[PDB]
């Protein structure tokens, strides 16, 4: 009855690709091909490596069997849809891990904290978020990333609301998908003792952990995007700036992190970004087909007979991703390298991809 | 499948009690006894009278059969529990109707379709300032706002990881459920479609307003609403009746006051509601004990603390809400210039009563 983790828990044939997790442009589609498309193991295998990298299994005395059981059940419940699938979830988890573990130039760091085995810079002039965000909160962020699109139907909130879908009625039209992802992932977790990887958290810790997970998942609703960005910019630019000893400031940083991780695509290398773009529109077209079937007008960018890739991505960058990156970068939280100047791979890719789409539009 | 409204849709022989709807201390428990306890008709019968009083049937071409079918289905889905039952829903509907239709001293009329009570310079009423569609949303919200309440608090559902708490991610667990279950009920059958003559835009807006009103009844958000309202009252210009967001906030404050009206009623009514509230709490206390949890404050039948419960509820929740609402100039009242406000007078009297009980208990 329970979905259990397969075979030997850890797949041994993935070592050369898994070693490359510590790069921003992780070749996730190579990992997909290496594991097999619809093998249904990518999320659990990556989650294991990242938790091991951070020493989170030891930190919270996490039983590995139950961890693998849960993450396998979770990944199986991501649908076989073109974008909001277990590969995207894995991508978002990798991105939050990267953003929280990799060197950030000029960040001061503060036991209750974990650090990546990949963290090699001995220079005072770098820090990382995992030096400032307690391990319990970091683990909540990582678990949130893994569960944040669970059981996505391949339709937007707007479609669910407009069609009075049962889920939209159930959630009173408020963050319909994001509520469902959190609630269905938590229901799954609670359903079986074979999934209880959090058994060694005390009651207070567990309740706090759950709260943090929910807050992070719910922050992925883009209806709230401008409010988060405005609030963060406010905190950065007030009298003291970000206060790492303040739990509310730390939550806001975690929310900005999962937000950036969710929409990381246009800040990846061209090859990755173009592959993800294909997934996004292919999912949209299935929605467009259903809209037509229901006699509704086809939503912008969702008409397979009239594709608008460049307009979609150019406007997504200009309106959503660009301002979020600028805000996060202004706070001094982007990974980068001293060269002193700073070289920031992430913002460089975003600029390059924005230029690319603009040029497509021009032609 | 569908629950349909009984017999002749409107019960005759209730006329003498129904004529008293236009008083604040409406004798609702006499109405209960007159209709019959667990007749399961009180909410639909009162709903009919108030919609008729406002001419809402004509205003929105509402078919009476479908209206009665829906409101009867709705009332049947309120459980037989001591407080959050169909009698409380009826009470809250009556209170929102009273607050929106009765004379308010010095309230100006906005310079939309509006409706007025058949019961209606120096006075105004809210129904003169809030469009009929929005008023109707508020009334429907009041009727559905505790639908299928299980007789346990949000905090209990959250602490016990109840399926509803998991479903709603611990956020306004009951209130989300009331709205969602009442709307699901509505949509389930064509026999319930009393809003058939609203156009699509109107319907979607109506649904939004109903949800916003029901969700506003979560007391976790109490101080946020009060602070926001006090902000709007005391800013540049005050309440702007032509502003849809200001109007929504007023409607939310209205349903909030209506929900917790009990301590602002005459002693007889307040004491009867108090008995219901604690009896429902004690069932929760019994279950807490059964589950090996500590018994929540005020929920221990072996050690009742009615006076401490109600004194603190008035001082911390009802009192500040009334003060905020009164500061906005929205309380029904009479010119004596000074104003005489029955509602705040009752609240003062009940507060004094509980304080005296506490004094004798020490
Ligand atoms: Mg999502
Ligand atoms: Mg309630
Ligand atoms: Mn996502
Ligand atoms: Mn209520």
Author numbering:
A (entry chain A): 669 to 778, 799 to 1027, 1069 to 1092
B (entry chain B): 669 to 779, 799 to 807, 812 to 1027, 1069 to 1094
The authors write:
To gain insight into how DNMDP induces complex formation of PDE3A with SLFN12 and how trequinsin inhibits this interaction, we solved the high-resolution crystal structure of a modified form of the catalytic domain of PDE3A (PDE3ACAT-Xtl) in the absence or presence of DNMDP or trequinsin. PDE3ACAT-Xtl is comprised of residues 669–1095 with two internal loops between residues 780–800 and 1029–1067 replaced with shorter linkers to aid in crystallization and improve diffraction quality of the crystals. The catalytic domain of PDE3A crystallized as a dimer with two dimers in the asymmetric unit. The structure is very similar to the structure of the catalytic domain of PDE3B23, with which it shares 69% sequence identity, with a root mean square deviation (RMSD) of 0.53 Å for the main chain atoms. The PDE3A crystal structures are essentially identical, with only small movements of the protein backbone at the active site to accommodate the binding of AMP, DNMDP, and trequinsin.
DNMDP and related compounds, or velcrins, induce complex formation between the phosphodiesterase PDE3A and the SLFN12 protein, leading to a cytotoxic response in cancer cells that express elevated levels of both proteins. PDE3A is a well-characterized cyclic nucleotide phosphodiesterase (PDE) that hydrolyzes cAMP, cGMP, and cUMP8,9. Here, we show that PDE3A and SLFN12 form a heterotetramer stabilized by binding of DNMDP.
